[PDB]
Amino acid sequence: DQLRQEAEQLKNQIRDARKACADATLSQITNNIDPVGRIQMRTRRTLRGHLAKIYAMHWGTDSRLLVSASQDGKLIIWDSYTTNKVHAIPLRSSWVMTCAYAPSGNYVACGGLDNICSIYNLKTREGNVRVSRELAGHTGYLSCCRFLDDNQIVTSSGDTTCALWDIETGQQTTTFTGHTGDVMSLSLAPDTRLFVSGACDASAKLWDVREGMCRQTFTGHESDINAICFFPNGNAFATGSDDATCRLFDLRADQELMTYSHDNIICGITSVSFSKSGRLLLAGYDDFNCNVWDALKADRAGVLAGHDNRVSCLGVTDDGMAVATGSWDSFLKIWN
């Protein structure tokens, strides 16, 4: 009908508004900043024990325990300080793409080609990990999940829809729709109130958890977005795509701030993360390597080479002491 007409008008208006706010790019503002220099990260720990391509990992809030999800139907809890496997949860479906470790540490999540989010109670009376909950309702593969709190979990699927679930009740508290492609990533805001989701339509979307509606849409990428991560301030985020680029968008400016891309990278980004200060943007690539960029300078501050296969997952501790990279070669690496 005729609505599309004014629709594109609105689009143009939005662009104009962003063009109204784009007076000085982030490169110009941070021109006088002293460069971070070359970043020397060496593999501190090598977590071995997975027998298939690892697709997910998530650090704990204690910065010591992490969880890794691999296609050997295994959800291994790792004590990165001592490389000791605290748990090895057998998954009912070996096709797992995501895993989340609860902020309290009592539960851990997983999900994948089975359109189910499995919540496992790590801390119980008998010391045995059991399936505390199986959240169903997504009609596509569960690509990401993040524990909103001890009882609510935000998950993103391949039917182009996110969902906030109440684990105790077991059904979707809210559903976030609007993406026209498979959501492939999901990042929770530090204040627990908002979250950004990157999908296959080359767009990211900032959603409000409580209201359940799309606050903002960021369309800067040329290809599908595989990774997303809030800046530690919570007012910005970074998205890695198969366009062989990461992009730093700002919530308040509602537009892209920076583009992290080099001519020597043609592979897509599987995972992005920020350091504790947000100065270093660590992105895992398909070229078997991880690149550490200067978030304020868009300059490659380092390369975390050392993975035999594609780096699928990446994460920085809450205290920022170390960064763990998982890979399709069935190993995790704690770098620090």
Binding site: L10, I39, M41, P232, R279, L280, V316, G320
Partner: protein
């Protein structure tokens, strides 16, 4: 496919009705957060191995 057009245009106008700050202010706030927490970033500044929990206990 006309029912979804109303929802799409409503979403677009809702997105356009938000308040936006200058990119210079956002960049300045980002720089301020980066420099204020640069001292507490172990990856930015390599921490001595005495208190590094992944090298020496």
């Amino acid at each position: 496919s006309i029912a979804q057009a109303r929802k799409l245009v409503e979403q677009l106008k809702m997105e356009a009705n938000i308040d936006r700050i200058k990119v210079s202010k956002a960049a300045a706030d980002l720089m301020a957060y980066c420099e204020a927490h640069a001292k507490e970033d172990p990856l930015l500044t390599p921490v001595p191995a005495s208190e590094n929990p992944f090298r020496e206990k």
